[PDB]
């Protein structure tokens, strides 16, 4: 089954893998982020309540006065979308926060608060998200992208190779809180551990460990194990555990009970260890020398003296052994230190310590934070405590705490926010183990180590910053907390949070002015991810590796979508099926696989989760069951792929399309083309521009539908039914009664978006695409937007194409186009220019807007109005005045069209600073918009009343139905008609209060919008009124313009040329476009050829259909041919029939197809070559597809017949007139007498220093001198050059450019005798 609308134009498809799951909602991530952000969800949990309870409760210290928070709410925004755009303000709604303030008595903490109060106080205003996930900050549309940042937690890195040029691999650890100070631990080539905070000066690690109030003996106990020697009357017999023997050499005869177990010098084999274990030999006799090398652990004291027999962490010898022996301490404890197993890093780390008392370590910390201040005991103590053990300046989020526990092999996922001593202890334990081999570094580029945020996250963080600021203010004012004479609006301040949020949205590396020129552009930009921004690695210093893609991005980040040149691999886009894990990571779908059945269900997996498992490859052969017919099948387990058994995977890729992102999912025949040009094209798809007409891209991919429906450029049908009124202005839908709700039934009105400004100065507009009284389905197109075609994305246009060298006109990529292509203007594009003028008040009077201007031709004034403003619809040109502005003195400063650009005025918007009058045209426009708004309100009220009264009539079909009485009286009183005692009468009564509400709401909305239009909208200070004007320019095509297809096939256009010079086939049809064959081999893509043959075949089918339509070939033959066309070969997904089709639909669909047969093709599950050959056989076209062509100029066949077909070219947004720019004599810069630059200001080309070197390379001397001197200064040189050139002379007096004199006399001012010489 298929929708009526979808049945309008069924797109042919090729594909074998069934669509187990559809394309999800593409714009999901932004909606998820914001809806999670804004909601009255209980228990916080990543919501505004979370921030509130983080900042609340609040009270001045021991003030017995607590401000507590009740609830938060958001009323409707002051405006809606369209009027907000027109006005230019933020699209935002307030934040009404119920706060409860309660104050106790003295010595009554637990006692009842003596006074209570609560109020819905005002706290700032927040912007709202658009239905398309966007925002409006000031009459402008922007997108907040998410940044792929590092996951908070703990990580470990090697830093090998070039480090110290010693070949000694280092090992570093970094604990990175979600919010708090950084922390890093670093070894050195001397095998000494160290620590630094915030990349500050290096310090020993253990210094902070003893600063954690742990004794040296305690520290060594934590980081070592005890080895015991007993004074058994001589020789200090040792307790031996076999596990402390591996990888060692016995310097003595290890023996016991009179039996030798290891001879002196014999290394301890595993056999010796087993001998000891089976014999169970623990106590042995060791020589004194073996104990000399050992290091004492603790501090011993003699009984008589009590003095230090030996300091902790000290090597032993016979003298110390005797000194402790006289005391008689039978217990001699050392620590098991091995070069291989337990390097004694802690020992010398302690020996390097400056001091021993925790106070000195705290003093060192305090000095290190802010060097050059006195060390204070209590300030240092509080500093250390709150630096890592206080929410104020340190915390770990759930994600941070979760991954911290996870890395530490722990069992609990949720824990404290601040650190604990054991946390650092165990992190150091892991570090030393990695130093010893167990464990490993964490590959940072791996996504599970990374993390992605979403708009709510940063927005809530800014809210928290503002919250703490206002909390500081509140505590300050509450330090003077008086006795209930104030309410909590003296406590509060509106500026802070609103300022923070609006500033962040305005200026930020994450809030970017959206790229709004094409549905694909905006959807891709929203589905974008970056590594930049706060906590984001800088563009210039970014590592080459992070640029490089890591294997785990499979399915999670499209390798093929990222802009090239200034940066690469930092702004990788979002994969299609990728969703966001609950913990800010990237969940990806998969198909569960049982013992032998590929479970079609979906199961989501995380990054690290994939590594543990092994997953079946996408293009896997299965037979009616999911049963992998091949016992050997390629699958990937841990960053690598190889052939595995039939039953070893429990998961299976969801679809071929998963591998790429939306920006790449639309490239047909990607599998046959190199990644380089693929990426280049995929970027180029972003910058495409719509033409006047859509062209239903022939070689579709099936993704056009999903992007179309999700991209809200079109008028989607919220519900099914029929359209009752169709117009360019709007559409009226009577929803089906079952679809229609019983109460509030009414009918829907869809408002089309008209011709209006883009974000690239292009045009954007919606047009209806459905006839009157036409069935319509829910969730479906009603009116296409730009570059959308019956709800399918039509970016560029498909044209007849050929590959051959044509008189060298296509040398590098210089595309060739016939005058036919421009003749029907199918490439033509529209652009909008919004020129603005302001009326500020200066000294010596304000800036007037009068028509009267001194010394201006009446012709310039002729196109203007009485006030001095142009009439809409004027075919203005570069130079003419638009609004007559004069600076009192009086002098002329009237706005004009930019030089060299024509156009036609489409509209003038006028806003006035509140408190100044309006001219005749401004008042007229105000009245016109008033009339338009009143008209809109009246017509919507009238049609809604008509629907309501028709519902009344339907109700009165029964219940005292009256025919002559009903139509006799007018619609004023239809309830007076008879009806028995039924709910219908009450239902009719309900409709009567609905009518009264319609009246009163209409009145109130009328008054409100009347005031809103009439009132002067707030403007920046100084301005009295601002006037914008919109100029339309219809730019068609010219040589130098840039266009390309869907294979990265970049190409500028050489020369529009006659139809008659072009080659043409035997039947005479010429080729619209000709491209260079040599792009194929070097630029390693061939899919253009395949799709070209495909489009040729599809167009041949369409031509046959059109021929049999022109001839009366009634649906029977057409039905048979279409049936033949749609089945067409191997296993497919269409599986459609024509027996079900409604001959009306047959002819309508044939008409839709008379211009071509749209073909769908997944990324890799597309058609095969023979299938293309199969379609060609269905067509009349040659199986090879290389057709003989005939030259227009010579008039005969070209030997070696030529590949020709159909290609979907796209018009890029680089029009030659835009890039065109020059200058001869304009304005000089203020700071220096040099030409300006750029196009917006009439500048000149920039001569670089490498161009200087090249000039120096040539012997040309005068050229360089004059170019840098008179073409960029000397008064005599430039004046005399003007005289020569106007006189006809071409000659220069080089002289000397006075800047040399400036430098010379500047030096002379200094005590420097510098001078010329003979």
């Amino acid at each position: 089954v298929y929708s009526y609308t979808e049945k309008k134009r069924i797109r042919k498809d090729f594909g074998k893998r069934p669509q187990v799951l559809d394309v999800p909602y593409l714009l999901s991530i932004q909606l998820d982020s914001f809806q999670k952000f804004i909601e009255q969800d209980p228990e916080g949990q990543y919501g505004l309540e979370a921030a509130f309870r983080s900042v609340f409760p609040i009270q001045s210290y021991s003030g017995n006065s607590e401000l507590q928070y009740v609830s938060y709410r958001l009323g409707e925004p002051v405006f809606d979308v369209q009027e907000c755009q027109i006005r230019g303000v933020t699209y935002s709604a307030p934040l009404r926060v119920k706060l409860r303030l309660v104050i106790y008595e003295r010595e009554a903490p637990e006692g009842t608060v003596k006074d209570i109060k609560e109020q819905e106080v005002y706290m700032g205003e927040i912007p709202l998200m658009t239905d398309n996930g966007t925002f409006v900050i000031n009459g402008t549309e922007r997108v907040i992208v998410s940044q792929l940042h590092r996951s908070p937690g703990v990580f470990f890195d090697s830093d090998k190779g070039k480090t110290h040029s010693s070949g000694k691999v280092l090992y570093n650890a970094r604990i990175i809180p979600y919010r708090g100070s950084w922390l890093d631990f670093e070894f050195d080539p001397k095998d000494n551990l160290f620590v630094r905070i915030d990349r500050r000066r290096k310090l020993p690690a253990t210094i902070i460990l003893r600063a954690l109030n742990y004794t040296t003996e305690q520290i060594l106990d934590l980081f070592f194990e005890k080895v015991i020697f007993e004074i058994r009357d001589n020789k200090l017999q040792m307790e031996l555990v076999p596990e402390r023997l591996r990888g060692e050499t016995a310097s003595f005869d290890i023996e016991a009970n009179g039996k030798v177990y290891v001879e002196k010098g014999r290394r301890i084999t595993a056999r010796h260890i087993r001998q000891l274990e089976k014999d169970d030999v623990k106590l042995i006799e060791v020589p004194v020398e073996y104990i000399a090398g050992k290091v004492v652990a603790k501090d011993y004291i003699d009984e008589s003296t009590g003095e230090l027999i030996c300091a902790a962490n000290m090597e032993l010898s016979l003298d110390l052994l005797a000194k402790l022996s006289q005391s008689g301490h039978k217990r001699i404890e050392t620590l098991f230190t091995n070069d291989l197993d337990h390097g004694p890093y802690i020992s010398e780390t302690l020996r390097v310590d400056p001091t021993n008392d925790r106070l000195s370590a705290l003093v060192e910390i305090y000095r290190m934070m802010r060097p050059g201040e006195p060390p204070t005991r209590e300030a240092a103590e509080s500093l250390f405590e709150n630096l890592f053990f206080s929410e104020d300046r340190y915390d770990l989020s759930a994600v941070g705490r979760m991954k911290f526990n996870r890395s530490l092999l722990r069992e609990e996922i949720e824990g404290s926010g601040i650190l604990s001593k054991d946390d650092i202890i165990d992190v150091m334990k892991k570090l030393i183990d990695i130093r010893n081999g167990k464990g490993e570094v964490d590959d940072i580029d791996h996504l599970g180590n990374r993390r992605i945020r979403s708009v709510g996250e940063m927005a809530e963080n800014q809210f928290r910053v503002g919250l703490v600021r206002v909390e500081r203010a509140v505590k300050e004012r509450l330090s003077l907390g008086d006795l209930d004479t104030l309410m909590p609006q003296d406590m509060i301040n509106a500026k802070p949070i609103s300022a923070a949020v609006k500033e962040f949205f305005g200026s930020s590396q994450l809030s970017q002015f959206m790229d709004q020129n094409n549905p694909l552009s905006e959807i891709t930009h929203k589905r974008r991810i970056s590594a930049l921004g706060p906590g984001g690695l800088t563009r210039e210093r970014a590592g080459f590796e992070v640029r490089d893609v890591h294997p785990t991005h499979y399915g999670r980040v499209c390798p093929i979508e990222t802009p090239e040149g200034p940066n690469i691999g930092l702004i990788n886009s979002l994969s299609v099926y990728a969703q966001t894990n609950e913990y800010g990571f990237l969940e990806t779908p998969y198909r569960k696989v049982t013992d032998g059945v590929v479970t079609d269900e979906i199961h989501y997996l995380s990054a690290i989760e994939e590594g543990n498992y092994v997953i079946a490859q996408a293009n896997s052969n299965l037979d009616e069951e999911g049963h992998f017919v091949e016992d050997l099948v390629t699958c990937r387990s841990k960053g690598e792929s190889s052939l595995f058994s039939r039953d070893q995977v429990d998961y299976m890729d969801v679809s071929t399309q998963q591998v790429v992102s939306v920006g790449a999912s639309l490239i047909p025949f990607l599998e046959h083309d190199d990644a380089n040009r693929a990426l280049m094209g995929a970027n180029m798809q972003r910058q495409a521009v719509p033409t006047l007409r859509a062209d239903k891209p022939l070689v579709g991919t099936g993704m056009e539908r999903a992007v179309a429906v999700d991209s809200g450029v079109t008028a989607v049908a919220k519900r099914g039914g029929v359209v009752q009124y169709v117009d360019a202005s709007r559409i009226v839908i009577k929803v089906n009664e079952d679809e229609m709700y019983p109460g509030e039934a009414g009918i829907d009105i869809y408002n089309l978006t008209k011709y209006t400004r883009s974000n690239q100065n292009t045009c954007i507009n919606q047009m209806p695409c459905v006839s009157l009284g036409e069935p319509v389905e829910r969730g479906d197109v009603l009116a296409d937007g730009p570059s959308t075609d019956l709800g399918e994305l039509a970016l560029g246009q498909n044209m007849r194409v050929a590959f051959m060298p044509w008189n060298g006109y296509n040398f590098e990529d210089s595309i060739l186009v016939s005058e036919r292509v421009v003749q029907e203007d199918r490439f033509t594009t529209i652009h909008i220019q919004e020129l603005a003028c302001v009326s500020r008040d200066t000294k010596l009077g304000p800036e007037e807007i009068t028509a009267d201007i001194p010394n201006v031709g009446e012709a310039a004034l002729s196109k203007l109005d009485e006030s001095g403003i142009v009439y809409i619809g004027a075919e203005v040109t570069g130079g003419d005045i638009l609004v007559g502005k004069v600076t009192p003195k009086v002098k002329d400063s009237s706005l004009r069209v930019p030089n060299g650009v024509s156009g036609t005025v489409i509209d003038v918007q006028v806003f006035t600073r509140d408190g100044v009058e309006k001219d005749k045209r401004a008042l007229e426009i105000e009245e016109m918009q008033l009339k338009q708004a009143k008209k809109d309100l009246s017509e919507e009220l009238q049609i809604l009343e008509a629907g309501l009264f028709s519902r009344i009539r339907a109700v009165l079909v029964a219940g005292g139905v009256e025919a002559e009485k009903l139509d006799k009286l007018p619609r004023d009183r239809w309830l007076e008609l008879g009806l028995t005692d039924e709910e219908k009468q009450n239902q009719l009564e309900q409709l009567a209060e609905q009518y009264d509400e319609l009246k009163h709401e209409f009145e109130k909305k009328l008054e409100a919008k009347r005031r809103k239009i009439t009132q002067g909208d707030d403007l920046a200070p100084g301005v009295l009124k601002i006037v914008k004007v919109y100029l339309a320019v219809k730019r068609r095509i010219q040589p130098g313009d840039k266009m390309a297809g869907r294979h990265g096939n970049k190409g500028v256009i050489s020369k529009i040329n006659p139809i008659e010079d072009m080659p043409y086939d035997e039947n005479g049809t010429p080729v619209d476009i000709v491209l260079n064959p040599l792009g194929v081999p070097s630029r390693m893509n061939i899919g253009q050829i395949l799709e070209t043959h495909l489009g040729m075949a599809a167009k041949g089918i369409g031509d046959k259909i059109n021929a049999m339509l022109k001839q009366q070939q009634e649906v029977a033959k057409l039905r048979e041919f279409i049936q033949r066309a749609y089945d067409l070969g191997a296993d497919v997904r269409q599986k459609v029939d024509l027996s079900t089709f409604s001959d009306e639909e047959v002819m309508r669909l044939a008409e839709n197809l008379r211009k071509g047969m749209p073909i769908a093709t997944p990324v890799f599950d597309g058609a095969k070559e023979a299938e293309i050959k199969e379609l060609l056989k269905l067509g009349d076209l040659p199986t090879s597809g290389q057709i003989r062509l005939y030259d227009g100029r010579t008039g005969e066949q070209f030997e070696r017949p030529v590949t020709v077909g159909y290609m979907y070219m796209l018009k890029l947004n680089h029009l030659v007139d835009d890039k065109m720019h020059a200058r001869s004599t304009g304005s000089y810069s203020l700071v220096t007498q040099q030409p300006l630059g750029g196009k917006a200001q009439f500048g000149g080309q920039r001569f670089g220093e490498m161009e200087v070197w090249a000039l120096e390379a040539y012997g040309a001397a005068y050229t360089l001198q004059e170019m840098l001197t008179v073409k960029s200064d000397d008064v005599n040189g430039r004046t005399k050059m003007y005289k020569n050139i106007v006189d006809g002379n071409h000659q220069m007096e080089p002289g000397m450019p006075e800047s040399f004199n400036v430098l010379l006399k500047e030096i002379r001012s200094l005590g420097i005798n510098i001078e010329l010489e003979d």
Binding site: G808, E1199, L1255, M1292
Partner: protein, 716 residues
């Protein structure tokens, strides 16, 4: 005021902006000539406002300047005549943003063209390395007549045809016209116009355009050449030559001086490059310019005639690819099982696996190349014959228009083995090929590789720019100031052999350089050339046929110029024929030339092949016990004195190497004399006698370690 970026030196002596300057995207307009360029009419209008005003007041159309400004901005009728008049003779500079080498700025004559894009001559784009992707080139205009003289005389394309880095013509045709010319000088065995005779090329073109004959077919045609063997005198001879129809048609475009053998080949990119080289080296400059212009035009026209296309069927996948891949899969499975059996290690397993995969890929490459090159098998007018193939892809590759063997290998066959981001080659190659579909994984890995390449290219671009900056700023000072230092001292130049084939010959290294000492041929007591003379191509070829191996030549480092360099020390100024001229600085061009390819850069025993006598250098040897010759000198090197007498082969001999022969003896070509054991340092003895333990203390200095294999131990 003096320091910092705002300091006057760094403020206003640096890359500035320039008035009377323009910019736009560029196009071809091939019908134009290399001595001339296109320019959109509007740009001409705004650029030359003062010039047009001067001509206007000269004609008195509007005396005051303001009225003239009004007339021109109105775009009145007479102004275009004035524009043509001023553009009658007024060249201008065309430039590109990444100005790496000096041809990136160049002088040309504008022609007024409609539209909105600049037509640029095809070939010079290659010098500009500026594809037509949308590159926006800029334009400047000289003002003083001296600057016009400089541009027309120095920055003129006619005066800029050869590279400064070296003498190859930078005007070599790039990709398309080369296809047409390759299409010319290639034979089909049997077609129209095969098997007759013609009196000249004119009727050859007549018959071709008639369609009565094929574009190419072996046919005897009378042709005439004009040779300058005499003392600058033409001698016109004529004779029949077998040739292809297209080849004879091409012969007309050749100037008089050149012979026909040069055109009688397949005309590859290198072949045509040396064609231009000969044309310039024999006939000077203007004939080269005209010849190149006509080459452009005719090749474009006949490439259009060609209908050179490309299609899916035009690529062929040999069936043996299936079989070869099957064999490779079986072999890798066998080796993996062997590893499972424990015979081999994982590292060795992987190494052998990649080796066999590479060998299978080489087999596939050979199979497809054979399938491609000679696929044309057809009747000869008889039964059957196989000739070079006329498939478009092989024509493209063999012509050298674009690509190489590797890319066509990727197109038809497997695209080899990809590495990982760590750079280690991956065990599993790309079994599939582009013509067939590529699985998810192969495309994924290829994307890893390609993105690595792209990021590396960006980094390499930045680093090359910075390094070039360094090279220019270090060498800004040096300039030629004297003709001759009068020094007798110079470097010695010889061919270069790394230990294999000679990599750069003597002709290239010595060309255009003034000898420091005269050349002494081995007709000893022969002053083959004077002592202080320049060596150009004729002299270099004289030396080459004379078999001169080492030549002492002047060098700049040996120059005794005070505060400068002597011209004779520098020799030829490449990009020009004559010796370097006085005053012309060379440090900047040298640095710029060496830096230009900075973008193009990247970020046991011996079997003697040649036959010759044996010579040794740093020789100190002895006959071993077995009678073979071993070397007692670490720095020894073996030369194979060829039959003529020159050292065609040189190899570094390690210590104590095994030699089946000795010095001053003859070795057959392909005889193993160079062999040795690279591991372990020998203690070979100079003399013979009893080996006493002189100063050997056992147990304190040395230790007695016993071998567990044989029993005969050795002191350690």
């Amino acid at each position: 005021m003096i320091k910092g970026k705002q300091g006057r030196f760094r403020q206003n002596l640096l890359g500035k902006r320039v008035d009377y300057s323009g910019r736009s995207v560029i196009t071809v307009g091939p019908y134009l000539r290399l001595h001339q360029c296109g320019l959109p009419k509007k740009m001409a209008l705004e650029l030359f406002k003062p010039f047009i005003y001067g001509k206007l007041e000269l004609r008195g159309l509007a005396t005051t300047i303001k009225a003239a400004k009004k007339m021109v901005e109105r775009e009145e009728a007479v102004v275009w005549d004035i524009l043509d008049e001023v553009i009658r003779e007024h060249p201008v500079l065309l430039n590109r943003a990444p100005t790496l080498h000096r041809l990136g700025i160049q002088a040309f004559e504008p022609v007024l063209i409609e539209g909105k894009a600049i037509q640029l001559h095809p070939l010079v784009c290659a010098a500009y390395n500026a594809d037509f992707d949308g590159d926006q080139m800029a334009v400047h205009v000289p003002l003083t007549l001296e600057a016009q003289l400089e541009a027309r005389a120095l920055m003129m394309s006619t005066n800029n045809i050869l590279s400064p880095a070296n003498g190859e013509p930078i005007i070599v045709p790039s990709q398309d016209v080369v296809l047409g010319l390759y299409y010319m000088t290639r034979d089909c065995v049997n077609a129209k116009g095969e098997g007759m005779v013609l009196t000249g090329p004119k009727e050859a073109e007549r018959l071709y355009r008639s369609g009565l004959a094929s574009l190419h077919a072996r046919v005897k045609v009378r042709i005439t050449e004009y040779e300058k063997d005499a003392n600058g005198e033409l001698v016109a001879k004529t004779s029949l030559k077998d040739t292809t129809v297209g080849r004879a048609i091409l012969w007309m475009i050749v100037p008089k001086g050149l012979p026909y053998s040069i055109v009688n080949q397949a005309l590859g990119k290198k072949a045509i490059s040396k064609m231009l080289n000969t044309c310039y080296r024999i006939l000077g400059l203007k004939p080269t310019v005209i010849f190149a212009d006509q080459i452009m035009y005719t090749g474009f026209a006949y490439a259009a005639r060609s209908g050179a296309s490309v299609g899916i069927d035009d690529m062929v996948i040999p069936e043996k690819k299936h079989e070869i891949i099957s064999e490779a899969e079986a072999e890798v499975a066998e080796i993996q099982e062997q590893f499972q059996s424990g015979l081999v290690t994982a590292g060795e397993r992987y190494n052998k696996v990649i080796d066999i995969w590479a060998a299978a890929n080489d087999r596939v490459s050979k199979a497809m190349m054979d399938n491609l090159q000679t696929e044309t098998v057809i009747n000869r007018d008889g039964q059957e014959e196989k000739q070079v193939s006329f498939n478009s892809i092989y024509m493209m590759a063999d012509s050298g228009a674009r690509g190489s063997a590797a890319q066509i290998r990727q197109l038809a066959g497997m695209r080899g083995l990809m590495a990982k981001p760590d750079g280690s080659i991956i065990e599993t190659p790309i079994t599939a090929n582009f013509r067939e579909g590529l699985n998810v994984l192969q495309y994924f890995i290829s994307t890893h590789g390609a993105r690595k390449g792209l990021a590396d290219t960006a980094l390499k671009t930045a680093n090359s720019g910075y390094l070039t900056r360094r090279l220019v700023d270090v060498a800004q000072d040096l300039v030629v100031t004297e003709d001759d230092c009068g020094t007798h001292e110079g470097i010695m130049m010889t061919p270069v052999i790394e230990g294999g084939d000679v990599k750069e010959p003597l002709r290239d290294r010595v060309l255009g350089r003034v000898t420091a000492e005269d050349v002494l041929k081995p007709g000893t007591a022969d002053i083959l050339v004077p002592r202080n003379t320049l060596l150009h191509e004729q002299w270099c070829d004289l030396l080459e046929e004379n078999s001169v191996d080492a030549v002492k030549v002047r060098s700049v480092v040996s120059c005794d110029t005070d505060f400068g360099v002597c011209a004779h020390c520098y020799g030829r100024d490449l990009a020009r024929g004559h010796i370097i001229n006085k005053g012309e600085a060379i440090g900047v061009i040298a640095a710029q030339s060496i830096g230009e390819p900075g973008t193009q850069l990247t970020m046991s025993s011996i079997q003697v092949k040649n036959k010759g006598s044996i010579k040794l250098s740093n020789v100190k040897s002895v006959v071993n016990s077995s009678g073979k010759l071993v070397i007692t000198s670490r720095n020894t090197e073996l030369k194979l004195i060829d039959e003529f007498g020159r050292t065609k082969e040189s190899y570094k001999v390690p210590y104590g190497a095994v030699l089946a022969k000795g010095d001053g003896e003859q070795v057959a070509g392909g005889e193993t004399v160079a062999n040795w054991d690279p591991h372990t340092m020998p203690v070979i003895t100079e003399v013979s006698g009893f080996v006493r333990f002189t100063d050997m203390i056992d147990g304190q200095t040395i230790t007695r370690q016993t071998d567990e294999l044989t029993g005969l131990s050795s002191l350690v």
